[PDB]
Each structure stands twice: as C-alpha cells, then as structure tokens.
Design a binder for these strands. Structure first.
Lengths: 227, 226, 226, 227, 227, 226
DNA sequence: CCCCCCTGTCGCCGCCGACGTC
DNA sequence: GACGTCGGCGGCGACAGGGGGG
DNA sequence: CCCCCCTGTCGCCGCCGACGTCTGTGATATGGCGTTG
DNA sequence: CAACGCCATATCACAGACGTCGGCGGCGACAGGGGGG
C-alpha cells in the first residue's frame, strides 16, 4: 500500500488534508516478455531509421503528427504554461446531488484518507455530504495533468469515506447516429407480457461470491503447478 | 465510427445481431516521438539480453516472473484451456434490479446497435428492460477476453438505445484497511448547522456544456498557431 | 528554528496546518552548579524523610497539601478525565475586534508557520483577518496544559504572518484594592502647569535601538576575558 | 497581596514613593511530591557526581559551561562591576507617547501605590500623565536583576492608578524569517469574499467572564471530593 | 536623638521625604516633686469648683473667659475648621533669598534627615538651595498646630543638611511707639571717639568654649556629691 | 504694656538704667478649662499619693527622679551658692563682629528703653555700638535665672534702640550625626538644570504682611459667633 | 534515509468492419 | 451477391519519471 | 532518525507586615516676682 | 505702697519612632519527558 498523492481539498478556505489511494488495484498477474533460449528478458531500444543509431531521451523532441504528415517539436515552456502543475490541492468547484451524474463518465475511483491531526475537519465534511447526499465536482490534478472528477461519500457501515471519480469530459462522449430506429414501430402487446415474464424468469440479485474470474484462477493454478 | 466488433446476444432461443461501438474514445491529441537530428519518427526494436542483438518477436517465449523467479515457459495448450474466448456471442447469466448496480463497478461503456432489419426484437428488448428496470448481467467476450458486463437502456428521447457497461471482478477492490477514520470524534452540532449553508453557498446542478478541458483547448490553439 | 509543536487551526469545517515557534528567546546565560573541592557538576538525589533513603522518580508519589496540611495521595487515571488537552488543534472559539484586549492579559507571543506545501488557506485567513480587523480567540493547548490565547495578524517587512498571544484567565488579573487614593487632595492650577512643564521638558520619542542590558553585556565581556 | 517593593519614581528631584504589587496571581494549584509507600516527605540533597559525597549550598561554586565544557567560578567582583542594583529607585528615563510601545514587548505588569503621606505627588503625576497621554519608560531593579519597563497610567473609574509594564529588551523579540509566505500566493477575487461571512458568522464581543479554565475548576472540585 | 516627625517636603511633585529632628533639647536639670512625710511622688486632684469631687479626664470640656467672664463651648468640628491640620507634610509656599529675612522672627530650629531611598532628590534640592542661597517659606504644620517656618541649607563640611526655622508671625512684634526713643541729644564727637576706642579696648571673638553654664554645672556637682 | 523688670547695664565704669520689655508677646488665644455640667473651673491641688492626704505647696519635698529613681534632699544654702542672681544688672563682657554668628541659638529678643534722667548716655552707647557694628556679648539675669544675651542696635525708622537677644548654652546646639547623608551620590547636570528651573519658577520675595495664622482668624470668627 | 512502489507514456502487435471491387 | 483489401481502431506490454514512508 | 525546550520542583535569599518597646510635645494649673494690693 | 503678667515648673495626657520576629515570593538550577527532524 502506498498513496499516489498528498494534498488538501481546496474548497473555499477549508484546506482539509487527504491522502489519495487507488481503489482498483491490479490483482491480475502482469506478464513479462522474455526469450527462453537465452533466459534473458527483452529490452526496447529506439533507433532512427535513416540514422541507424540509438538515441537518448534528451535528444528526442515530442512531435505532433498532423493530417498533413508534418512534424513540429514541442517546447517545455509551452506545455509548462499550465499553472495547475504546482497546485497540490483538489480544487473544488461546486456541490451537486449524485442523482444527476451520468454513469457513463466514471473512469476511476480513488480512496481519500485524512491526516490524523485534522480528522475532525474531515469527518465533519463527510457527514455533511452524507446528510445532504451530494457529490462535489472537483479538478483533480496529477502527473502534470488535470482530470475533472466528482467527489462523493459512500458509507461503509462502520465509517464514512470520501472518494473521487474521474469524469470524462461531456464533449468526449460521442453522440450516436441511429438510422435504424427512425422506422415506424408496431409491437403487439400480446408478446410484451411474455417477454416480461421471460425477463422475470431469472429474478435474482448480485452474487459476488459466485462471480469468480475463472481465467485468473486457472492461471494461478498453472503458475502454482510450475512451482 | 466503425464498430470494434459485431455479434449477437445469444441466450437460448433469444438471439439478436448486434454491432458494438465504443461509447468513449480519447480525443486528446497524441504526438509522435521524433529525434531532433533525424527530425523524424524513431522506431523501437526488441533486443535480446544475452544475445546483444535484435530477436524476432515470433522467437520469444512466453514467461512470467514471480517472487521465486522460476523460468516459466507458457505454451498455447494451457492458454486455450478456456473455451469461452472462442465464443463470439454474449449471453445473459442472471437479472438484477437497477438500484443494485453500483457506480463503483463501471469500467467502460460500449454502444450496441443492430445489424439485421429485424428491429422488432431490438425495440422489444429495450422496452421490456426499461419497464422491468433490471440490468442484464452479461459475460462480455470480446477481443478473445472475457469480462463481466451489464446491459441496460437509457432514454435519449429520440432513441431507446440498449448498450452495455463493462464491470470488474470483486477481487479488484481494495479495502479501507485503516481505523484512523474510526476514531470516536464528537462534533458540535452548531458546527454542522453553520457549515451547512456554507456547503449550499455553491449549490448548483450538473451543466455538462459549461465544463471543458482548458489545457486541451490551449494546446489545440497553440498548435494551430504553429 | 525549532518548533515547539505542530498542530492545525480548526473551527468547524475550516482547517489549516500551522507550525508554532518561540518568538521570545532570552539570551541570558545559564550556569551549572559545580563545587570547587572537586570541580564536578552537581547531582541531585531524591531522599526520603520518613524512610531516610533515596527514592526513584518512578517510585516517587505525587500528593497535595491543603489548608490543614493533610497529605492527599493523587492518582494519574482520575486527573486525566479531561479530554480536551489530548486535542492537538488550536480550536478557534470566536472572532473579536483586536482593540478589545487590554495589554494586561498578553502573556507570551508565538509565531505561526503553514505546514503543508500549500499555504493558500493560511494566507487567505491572514488576509481576511487583516482586512476585517478582528482578533480570533482560541483555546490554545500545548504540553497537556490548555491555556487561552488570541490570534492576531501583524506584518513583518516581507510577510503578513499572524501570531497567537497567550492570555491570562480573567479571574487571574487582580484588582487595585487600595483605599489610599480614593481620597481627594486639593490641588492648584499652577501646580498642574508646572508639572506639565517639567514632564514635557523631558518628553521624547521611543528609540529602542539604543536600549540594552548593561549587566548582560558586562557579564558577557567578563566571561570572554576569562 | 503582600508588597514586593518600596522605592520611588525619581526623574530629577521628584521621588514619589511607590509600593510595587504583583498584578497577576496564578490560581493554578501547585502540588507536592512525597514517598507515599512509606509516607515520607521528599527533600533534595546536592551530591557530587564524581567525588560522590553530599555537600552544602555554600561549597558549590556557580559555574559556567561554554562550547568547550569549561567551568569558571563567578566571584564577588562580578557583582561589584555593576552598581545599578544598589539603587532602590525606579529611575525614570524618558517620557514618550503610549502608542510607541507594541504589544510584542510587554512581559509583566505591576501596580504602584504610594506611601499614604505622599499621595499628593502620586496623584499629580498620574493626572499629568493621563492628561498629556504619555508613556514613562523607566528602569527596574528587583532582587538584583535590572529589567527595562514602562510606566503608564490607567483609569479604574473611582481611582486612577499608574502601573509598570516590564519590557523585553528590543533585541530579545524574535524576527519572523519565513520564506514560505514570501513565495507568491494567488487567490481568485470571489474566493476572498466568501470567508467574510464565515468569520462574520462567528463574530462576537470580547467578554472576560465567559472564559474560564475548566481544567482547574474540575481539579478543584475533584480535590474537594477527595477530602 | 529620636525623631519627632515623618512627613515630606511637598510642592508640586518634589515630595522629598524628611524626618524632622529637635535641635534645641533642654539639657537642664529636669526636676521631680515628692513629699517628705509620705516619701512618695505626688498627683493632682481634678476637683470641680462646685462638685467637690475628683473629675476624670474625659468628662472635662473646653471654654474661654473674656473680660466679662462669660464662657464659650467649642464643638469637635469647630476645632477642625482649618483642613491644614490634617496635612502631614511641609507644604512649601515660595522661595526667598536667605539674606532678606531678619533674625528677629527666628523662633526654633529643627534638622531634616531624609529617608535613605530618597537621598538623591533631597541632595539635589539642598544643592540647588545652596547654589542660589535661596531660603524657602513653608507651613510647618506639626502636632495639629500650624506654624510658619523657614527652610534653608546649612553646610557642615562633611555633608550639607537643611534646617527649618520656625518664624514668629510678623504681627506679633510689638511696636515701640514710645516717646523716650523720639528724643535726641547733642553729643560731642570727641566723646564719641573716646567711647569708640574704649569699645575696641575689649575686642575678642566668638568663643563658646570658655562659655559655660554656671548654675547648671554647680547643680550637677551637687547631684553627683549627694549620691 | 508693662516692662518685666528694670535694671541697668553696668560694664566697667559705664552704667545706664534700662527697662526690659517683651519684644515678642504671643497673641495666641488662651482658653481656660471648665467642666460644662459643673459650670465651673476645675481647681487642682497637690495631694499625697502614698499617704492619700491633701498636701499644701509649702511642705512638698524638692526631690529628684534619677536613673535609679531615688529621692533628693536639697537645702537653701546649696541652691543659694550661686551669687549671680543677687545682681540686677546686665554685664557687658566683650565685643565681637556680628556678621559671623548664625541664628541657631537665638532664642528670645527683648527691648531696652531708657530709665536714666540723662538721655546722653543711652544715645552714646546706642550710636557707638551701631557704628562699631560689633555684638556686645553680655549676661542676662532675671528671676534667679541667668542666660547670656547679645546687645545690638536696630533702626525702626525714626528710633534707634540698643536691644538684647537671649542666647542658648553651646551644648544645646545638637549635632546632625547621621551617616545617611554622608553617603556620596552623583548628580546629573540635566537634573540640576531642571531643579534650577522649577525652583526659580516659585522664586519670590518675602513680604511679612501676607502671612497670617488663618486658623487664628477663623477661631476669632468662631468665638465671635457665640 | 532510503529506498522502494505506481502510473502516464507511447511504439509494437494484432484483428475486424467498410466499402472498393469482381 | 459476394470477394477480399484496406485502414483504422484497438489492445499489449514495455518504459520514465513522480513521490511515500520508517 | 534525533537533541532541544517546556513544565514542574526544590531550595534559597531577600523582603514585607504586624507586635512590642518607650519618648518627646502641647497644654493646665499652679508659684514669685515686677506692680499694685 | 510696693505680689499678681509673665515666665518656669510639674506632669499629664497623648501621638509617634524604632527594633524583632515570622512568614511570603522571586529565581536560579535541575530532572523528566515531549516532539520537534
């Protein structure tokens, strides 16, 4: 366990400290690319095609490939123009109910953990959010990149915790083109009840215990057999 | 927009052809790495460690490195032991009410559209799912990988589109293993009632049109100047 | 310098890390007890009246003497019933105008430093305090001895740092019980005129740069020579 | 309420008698150690650390340790060097406006009341100071320790007594050298206005009566319970 | 050798403390009275003019007799008409050159020995008076009886002390409006010159040493011889 | 006004009868003592204490109370040993310059007026002593009490009178033996200037007519009311 | 103090729908 | 009406810096 | 990672406040002598 | 016809100086423990 950032929520003047944690930990085994004949792992070296020589990270300049096939180098100052890089606070913008968030924009969920000294000023805000049951659209900033996100509280029975959901930009979600539904619809209700009863035939709820990653278990058994 | 893959929702006698799109595709500008002296693209090439030279990808043996570090030679017979990967159709295993679905477990959104002209089945399934309001849990099998997913509908006004939302396994969620938040800390209710209106001082509603990425717009304009 | 402690202001939702420092360092010279016969640094032993033997710090019991002088054996668990001192927060209580604290009460002055990498909340609080011109009275706690204080802001050349001034409990400030001045003495205007003349003849303006402790400098020079 | 002084303000040939009094009495309770196991009161005995024998107060020589761990015995000539302590007078130095002394410096306060016979000069000087609104910075020698101070008047309604506020030597007060605040802090204009209602929601008037040491009163009640 | 007063020279603010001392102590043979037959001391009997019985001190009352023999009753406040009786200080009034006042009015003298802590102010005042050789007129109010006096500095070589000389009221000096003084005589100059040289015939200087008390010394010899 | 006694100044072969007068006759008001309820004077009589009997003044023992509290038997011859009282004249001893004696011992002043038929003598001594300007140190005798006095000449405008001032025994001028003033204290020049300014502010001239015993005046009014 | 993990980042690899075309 | 080529679209998996905590 | 600095005790010296001791001053109330009685 | 205004003398009453004694409180130093690096 290791936090990925350390900052304070910057709403108003509150400056409540928090420690960000990644909820979705990659339990899946990460495979490696090696060659059995030499038993030595492979490495990647980038060589200019015409030059025929390897290069170091310092000599490469980022170039944006346009539709015209023209390369333009990117300067550090131009990319560095963003002033939020030095900001280590989750700059809250406004508080909104959680019912109006489109479930399509969720990207990743992080766990917020406060500082022991100021636990009083964290649990208070969490309790207020729970009582009002509202999100809080923030401007999450990490690795010199800003990811719009919403902050919401999910009670875990014993305690309350704050978590931030990275949100896709509303312009990102692509509008669909639907030339199929334009046709007239004439459905006999006689089949409506039949279909509805078919749907209700498998009436049940979530069963997390039954939901087991079969392939992951098989791979785990295989690697155990290897040893 | 070209569908990533096309298939059908095969569950017993119920079967509808479907072409699957991607609801979201990163529109952030991507740049090609170049070398200043070259002023052109640079190509990565695999090099063997002991050999000191480039070895073809086809001559590389699958392996996994654990804590012990034993040399693992993964073949194809064990990888193909799962027959689900071959299956190009997606079946509903169970049904669950919409409320039970949590916002936590969404992974990605894929748009579903039909292929044949038998639009009766599409609208019928959309209507019954909307009325029952129970999410169709599916073991999505695409890209020869199987992941849990749920199918549902939302009202576009113009369209009653049915489409899926990938899900992750319960093993992927870490627990909040820290009792610091569990400390019994009392709070003066006056503090709560004075921070209340403070919270609502900014109260508003979702306005997706207003929100945008300032950095991406700045980069777009900057490259436009270039 | 070296911080005495590191807590954080807290009134309801608001919070801000602060790092107190000592603002009055006395450069008066501390000596050590030595004896000429052997020139060895003295050592102290806790010695028992009744039992006539050395009794350790751990084996030493605290007690109290009342008006009758009866010994009272106290216990640590009972005294610790107060939970406030455990708090590591400068729990602000109210905001009041700065001019409403007579110089009777000020006891000690302490600087403040924002702890986290970002000082936005600290700077904003300092600015609002400077503008509205209001002191903030806090229940400063330190070393398990809670002591009332007050928050005020005053610029020093380059910064608008704000400081906390400890305060005396109003019941501590005595009163001038003196029936010798309430008597009225006959006086003449010429006496007032001459008194004003003599007083204002010696009047001047504060120039602290030329005020120093002659005894301290003398001792410093004497030790330097030795 | 037992005096600690009997001198006289003397700037020239004035010499108004004054009785200095402690203006801050600590109601805090001071405890006492004891060997409760055998019921034996505790006393401290000065014992050599090297030669290891108990000694009397006279023998120990006041010794100073420098960076080299030296030891110099302070003799009588050190006392003889400064003759200022031989004076029992509050030798007024200058008269300045009261506004010229900052609250940074004030250290302790005492109340001056005169010998009953010389009340005339006492009240005349206090009245002159009050009317002309002047500080009266002085010197001060209590138990052989010369401390700067300031003499300022203060009306108490029925009576008007002048008091001496001891001052810290201007060099003693520390200077805040904090580079963190020097770095530029940027705040959007709408942010600052928000805090005004936050502080205004808690504004009040300073009333001494409300505040009281709960710890001390609880301890007093507890000990009353013990008896 | 024991003091009589503890006040303070108080004009404006100078308020210099002083302990007035007696300069004219009667060294005569202070005698006592007894009776031979009883061989014991005596005591008066306060018998009325009419009661015929001894009256206690408290019961007696004050009154005055005029030419007509009437009586007057004085109340307690009547005696306290002048508030200056309550005064407990030598309230200086003015300052005059020493040579101006005639030695006619000088009635009694006293010594002023200041309080130790007030040596500076008293020394400054004495030096000031000596430099300008200026007297000072003061209402020396002692033992409830006001009395005009005069304050000046007398050198003693070792140190300078300031004494207060009581002054008789100017109206007290009887006017010699007598006719005998008016008459004048015709006087030859030669007799004036011979008389003058006769005056010089017994020239001498101030020699109080050869001056002695005859009767007092003889009584001292007698009282030494008797016992 | 009645002269206290009449004698002469007999020094050498020069004699001049004189009429001594009380120069300083106190005008302070003397009130008697009466028991108001009695309405009469309280007459005191010498009464034996040891034997408890009324004793007349003609047998009281002239006894002393020394350190041991003994008793003294005094005869007439021993107290009559001194023959000076037998003389009823003033004896001029010598002559000394007047400016070199301080007024410390000057006790009482008495007027001298001519009693001789010949006016020549009185004016002769008056003028010669006035011109020589030398004090005439003489012995004064009165009612068995002999005290020294000095004769001087004072002009009252029209009149010139030789006049006698009593003097005290040399041992009666006590000494100011006290080390408190012996201690030497440094003087600051600025304090000296301040003292000179303040004292000079009240500097004035002595006019006899201004000063009256205001208490005596108000007592006069008070008695006048009755 | 050291000393060790986590995530943008992008080039290499691979596959399947669209629409030109037989 | 039915081949099958292409092009893009996505994913795989290695890497390069960012901090975290004792 | 730590060594510094609050905080509480202790012992010590120096200082004040009340108790006890006597001593000198102002006034009453008579004498002897100048003067009248 | 030269003893009764003015000055001691007695002391009586009364207000104040001066010396002892016990207690109260600054303060210089140490010890312990916390939370800073």
């Amino acid at each position: 366990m290791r936090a990925i950032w350390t900052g304070s929520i910057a709403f108003g003047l509150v400056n409540v400290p928090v420690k960000v944690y990644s909820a979705t930990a990659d339990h899946d085994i990460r495979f490696h690319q090696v060659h059995a004949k030499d038993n030595g792992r492979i490495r990647y070296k980038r060589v200019c095609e015409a030059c025929g020589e390897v290069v170091d990270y310092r000599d490469l300049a980022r170039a944006y490939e346009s539709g015209d096939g023209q390369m333009v180098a990117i300067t550090d100052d131009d990319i560095a123009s963003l002033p939020e890089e030095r900001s280590r606070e989750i700059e809250v913008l406004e508080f909104v109910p959680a019912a109006d968030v489109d479930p399509m924009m969720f990207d990743r969920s992080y766990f917020l953990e406060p500082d022991s000294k100021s636990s009083k000023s964290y649990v208070l805000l969490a309790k207020t959010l729970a009582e009002t049951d509202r999100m809080a659209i923030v401007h999450f900033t990490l690795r010199n990149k800003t990811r719009l996100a919403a902050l919401r509280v999910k009670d875990f029975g014993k305690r309350e915790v704050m978590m931030v959901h990275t949100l896709l930009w509303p312009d990102e979600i692509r509008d669909p083109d639907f030339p199929v539904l334009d046709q007239k619809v004439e459905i006999k209700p006689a089949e409506l009840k039949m279909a509805g009863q078919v749907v209700d035939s498998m009436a049940d709820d979530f069963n997390p215990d039954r939901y087991h990653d079969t392939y992951q278990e098989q791979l785990q058994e295989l690697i155990d057999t290897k040893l």
